[PDB]
Design a protein around this nucleic acid. Structure first.
Ligand SMILES: [Zn+2]
Ligand SMILES: [Zn+2]
Lengths: 682, 682
RNA sequence: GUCAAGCCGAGGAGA
RNA sequence: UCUCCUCGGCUUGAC
RNA sequence: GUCAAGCCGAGGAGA
RNA sequence: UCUCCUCGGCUUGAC
């Protein structure tokens, strides 16, 4: 085992109790300190002949795998038992046994939280914090209002308050395990005033029951000498192109609005216009009136097209619009086949013509963009001066930006002659209609980029966290900004001597202000850390107890308000109607539930009312006669049961029918019966 | 006849209807209970003057023979007629007559299933379950998703649902026979949560229409007193040798990969690397490109060599590699005789040299292994302390492990001076290129080991089931684990007072976790058995009917999806090409079928295109000009017809030719004509 | 009584 | 989906 | 080992 | 409240 002087200095208090936090810059070997502390604690327990239980909590499965593979297991594999859990991992043994089997655990917090909830509900034995002797948390800054770590530590704090009550009343008390937290930047919860930043840091400490931040001061110099600082670069551009195509799109906007006779009262292409369109569509659906709901949806689509145009070339906005409208036309063709609306037909007659005109206009690369040209100039100069040693990382905002920029970079032959290789990267969560990337695909891309099979990697906020890469020189941000914590993490991910942290932005975005404020929050955070390290121990204890009570009572009354908050036992006392068109779809008696998860009806009347879409190229889509999507087919129990999304339906109570929208099955108060499938048999 | 109090307690409900299950530990005389119940049922039928038909179903022919010989026949031979059937037995009488002749039957389930299928298809009269009056099933735990017992009981459950429909509609109904099931551990279908284990047990009960598990509780104590528990032992070793030879093999790996310019992206020696190699070879064959398919195959061979090295000494991996490459060289010599490829010749020039070097290096027993040394130490201490009373049983994973360990144990003189005698044992199914052991050979080895002619018996999963041996003290597992059911059966096969259940394992394998989880699943299974025995009879009936409908509908829609699932009447509309090399081999017009089983072509053009290998020392092998194996010669009809394996060929449709691999004759949609051999005559 | 070949299906373990 | 292991059934043929 | 679907919760940014 | 992005957990199913 190897340790360094500043590591001892920071970790010295933890060696004897002192449940504390640790904050060190990236690449400081925090995991090494954690493993050393765990080994010391286990040795002390074995010498003392008491049970030694250690758990490590991480918010990312990849982090758990990396910790169990690279650093944690190899050092301590021989002395004790080690294992790493996760949802992906097949927890075939159990959670409780691995707790009372290995004496050392690595896992995501939510697994432990689920075990605790099972224990309190009595469904499973689960485990209690008292069964442990040491908790280690990674990325403490995520411990906040009601995150998972915060739930675990709220449980611990309730136990500690119970112990406080007993000590002055009953001598026996439940022992509480030591708590160690790790991070690099504890962060600022939007607190601007340095006093508010101090309050935020004290809240973080109280959430962990931390005795002190305990940052390195004496040996700090040597640490600073060992760590290096990259180089920055700012680049700003102004928008003056897009006039022809954008003006034509705005003319289409105006025509549609005059058809609807509506006043947006806001500049076109802003998310406020999207919000207004959503509100208008919701109101139209609630009132049951047509001619505006479908028009509101189309206005929303045109607004999204205008936004993507503002951010991306005309061809991408055209592709989005024509894909959506080709899907709508396929819906209309299917509706005609199984068997004319003034709004739909008016819009479509306007469209076909304007779509042909915009196809003709789209073949005009004279005014495509300038930010992309400037990006090309940047890319080429840095990669040419790198001479094949450029590990380019691109950060953008959305999925479509990544896809389109990767495609158009591959199209360009200048990068090809330079030898650049570009591949895109995105998250896992399925959303935005875009194909998510599987964790296996993520790992494949990262491995290719590490070994050099990929020289240019387009990514999103995922790259800003994790993604341990040996070399990262040219890290460019294409008009985005998240916060000081992620900003510092990304700027520290450029782990190379001559690394360019380049910010390619539009003049409108004030990212320079945010980076300046981030550096100032960094120095303010260091100052607040020094202050708290210099605050009175008694006052520090009083304030941490204060914020502990804050959190405890907040959670208590959150449960109080959310005991039920919605109670009604009315199995079949509503009518569900279609959204775009108002016809009786179902009632509360013909519908049934599966697994307490999926809602579906199987009555032949339902069968002979809807329409089925040929699956896009088993789980085929199901739609209405007006083209409104109702759900998807499912194969559970073997029956081809059409599950439906309540977001696409509307509700009407039999009592008074105040039409409203739910947007989610759980949100509504009433309950639907479980699918007792004794019927449908033969 | 002899019976014991707990046997009456468990079997009392079955004496009057109550189609149920029974679970008792090994050596509890379950067969005695079954024969007593059968005698009681027959006596009741004769007193009542109604036909009494009893069938016994077993999944192993040896089990049927043992039951008919030792316990079942002798007790009841006088009162009624008894017989035991099996595929090995010459069923010259018939199935239906023995059903309506003996009034008592012992057989494998598949015989009854085939009779039922013949009856439904109308080809043969067959028999129906209504013709029976009592079914007894052995090893109920095998009754699962779609095993044979599950098919029989699905037929029975469909009949029962028909009867349920009639009772409320038509008074007359088809009588259903009583059902009795037997086992020792009903098992857990991977269900971890105790609720999921309860669901699995309820599914098992529903599959058998069981009214209750009916386990012994009152007299359980006496049973526990009568049965004894062996002693356990764990031993773990770590791997640090193999560096020279393994490093040289990995250098060969790297050279081959650089020749192919491929990135495995995974640690060498893992089955994932084998899967990737298989996928790459399949892709190469599909695309018709060479230089990678043969290279992929050789990479697979080297991976297998590395795995066997990791598990076994260097000499075994060398023997495997040199045998395979000597076969390849014999193929090449034959190809040269009947008449140079860059990949083959490059690989072979690399090989000859590296093979000579590895021969020179192989004579180095300084770092052969440590797990084998530890195994030797174990073996010697237990056999020395046994003083010739050691019935050693060794469990391993594969055929080659058994062969090599037996050979190397016989080579060692320490066991020889101790007087140890070692013989290997394997299954019957032909696979892995290894000579399978005939059931006659199996019986010979088991008889020799029982009488003491063999003191050490190396075996595989076969030994974990059946293999009734009087004495078994030292049962050692050399790095393997299957499940809780087989674990408990094997641990109960150590039927002696002082028996050592020894687990010799590598530190990597977590067999200790699995055995702990197996004991915990045992107690959880007992708890679930108690619960179901304490569940409400009405709720129990409802849930069993629920799962019965589950299974019935699942099978219904499985047939629905598998009515045909692949339909095409195109006698000669494809071209079959060789796999390793892409040349036209045959078409769909020149090929013919025999017995609906064997595929072959006899055109002289086919004759003058392939090559024949001298049979390894009638059914000689047939190969291509590129060394690819095409099939084997056959003598059916008397003609020397070369049958071919579709796994070694590739297909090309005349319409659009999307090259694909079938791997099996049945899987493909099209049909080939029967061999009308009116041609070829004179 | 013994052997060889081929085909079909099923289960378990691992990945 | 792949590997390993196990089981049963069917057909042919030979000794 | 791989894939698809669905559901639940949480965090960050913007408005 | 809406949009965008990210994360984790659960269930099912298939290969
Ligand atoms: Zn509608
Ligand atoms: Zn060939």
């Amino acid at each position: 085992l190897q340790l360094r002087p500043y590591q001892m200095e920071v970790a010295q208090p933890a060696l004897d109790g002192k449940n504390i936090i640790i904050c060190l810059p990236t690449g400081s070997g925090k995991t090494r300190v954690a493993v050393y502390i765990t080994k010391d604690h286990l040795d002390k327990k074995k010498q003392a002949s008491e049970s030694g239980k250690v758990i490590v909590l991480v918010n990312k499965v990849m982090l758990a795998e990396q910790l169990f593979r690279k650093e944690f297991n190899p050092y301590l594999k021989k002395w004790y038992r080690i294992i790493g859990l996760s949802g992906d991992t097949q927890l075939k043994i159990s959670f409780p046994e691995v707790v009372k089997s290995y004496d050392v655990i690595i896992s995501t917090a939510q697994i432990l939280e689920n075990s605790l909830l099972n224990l309190e509900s009595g469904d499973d034995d689960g485990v209690q914090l008292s069964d442990f002797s040491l908790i280690i948390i990674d990325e403490c800054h995520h411990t906040n209002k009601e995150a998972v770590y915060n739930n675990i530590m709220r449980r611990y704090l309730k136990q500690k308050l119970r112990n406080n009550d007993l000590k002055k009343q009953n001598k026996p008390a439940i022992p509480l395990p030591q708590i160690l937290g790790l991070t690099a930047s504890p962060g600022v919860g939007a607190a601007k005033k340095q006093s508010e930043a101090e309050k935020h840091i004290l809240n973080i400490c109280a959430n962990l029951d931390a005795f002190t931040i305990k940052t390195v001061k004496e040996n700090l110099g040597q640490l600073k000498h060992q760590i290096k600082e990259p180089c920055k670069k700012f680049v700003i551009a102004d928008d003056t192109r897009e006039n022809p195509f954008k003006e034509k799109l705005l003319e289409i906007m105006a025509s549609i609005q005059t058809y609807c006779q509506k006043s947006p009262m806001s500049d076109f292409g802003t998310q406020h216009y999207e919000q207004w369109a959503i509100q208008m569509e919701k109101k139209a659906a609630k009132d049951g009136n047509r001619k505006d709901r479908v028009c509101a949806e189309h206005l929303r689509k045109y607004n999204e097209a205008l936004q993507i145009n503002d951010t991306i070339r005309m061809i991408d906005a055209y592709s989005h619009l024509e894909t959506f409208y080709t899907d709508e036309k396929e819906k209309k063709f299917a509706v005609l086949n199984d068997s004319l609306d003034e709004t739909d037909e008016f819009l479509m007659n306007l469209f076909f013509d304007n779509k042909k005109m915009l196809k003709k206009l789209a073949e005009n690369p004279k005014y495509e963009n300038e930010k992309l040209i400037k990006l090309r100039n940047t890319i080429l100069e840095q990669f040419t001066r790198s001479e094949e040693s450029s590990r380019g990382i691109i950060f953008t905002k959305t999925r479509q930006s990544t896809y389109a920029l990767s495609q158009w970079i591959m199209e360009n032959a200048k990068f090809a002659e330079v030898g650049v290789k570009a591949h895109h990267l995105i998250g896992a969560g399925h959303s935005s209609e875009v194909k998510p990337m599987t964790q296996t695909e993520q790992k494949e891309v990262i491995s290719k980029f590490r070994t050099g099979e990929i020289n240019l990697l387009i990514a999103t906020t995922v790259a800003e966290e994790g993604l341990d890469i040996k070399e990262c020189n040219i890290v460019i941000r294409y008009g985005l900004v998240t916060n000081e914590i992620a900003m510092v993490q990304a700027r520290g991910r450029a782990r190379a001597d001559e690394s360019t942290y380049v910010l390619v932005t539009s003049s409108g975005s004030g990212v320079t202000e945010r980076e300046i404020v981030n550096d100032f929050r960094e120095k303010m955070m260091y100052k607040a850390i020094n202050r708290v390290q210099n605050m009175k121990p008694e006052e520090y204890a009083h304030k941490i107890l204060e914020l502990q009570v804050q959190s405890i009572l907040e959670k208590k009354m959150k449960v109080k308000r959310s005991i039920a908050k919605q109670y009604n036992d009315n199995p079949s006392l509503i009518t569900l109607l279609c959204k775009n068109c108002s016809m009786l779809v179902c009632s509360g008696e013909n519908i049934h539930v599966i697994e307490k998860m999926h809602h579906v009806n199987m009555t032949p009347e339902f069968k002979g009312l809807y329409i089925v879409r040929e699956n896009k190229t088993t789980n085929g889509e199901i739609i209405c006669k007006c083209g409104q999507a109702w759900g998807t087919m499912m194969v559970h129990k073997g029956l081809d049961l059409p599950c439906l999304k309540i977001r696409n339906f509307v509700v009407n109570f039999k009592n008074n029918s105040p039409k409203k929208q739910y947007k989610k099955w759980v949100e509504l108060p009433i309950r639907f019966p479980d699918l007792d499938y004794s019927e449908y048999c033969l």
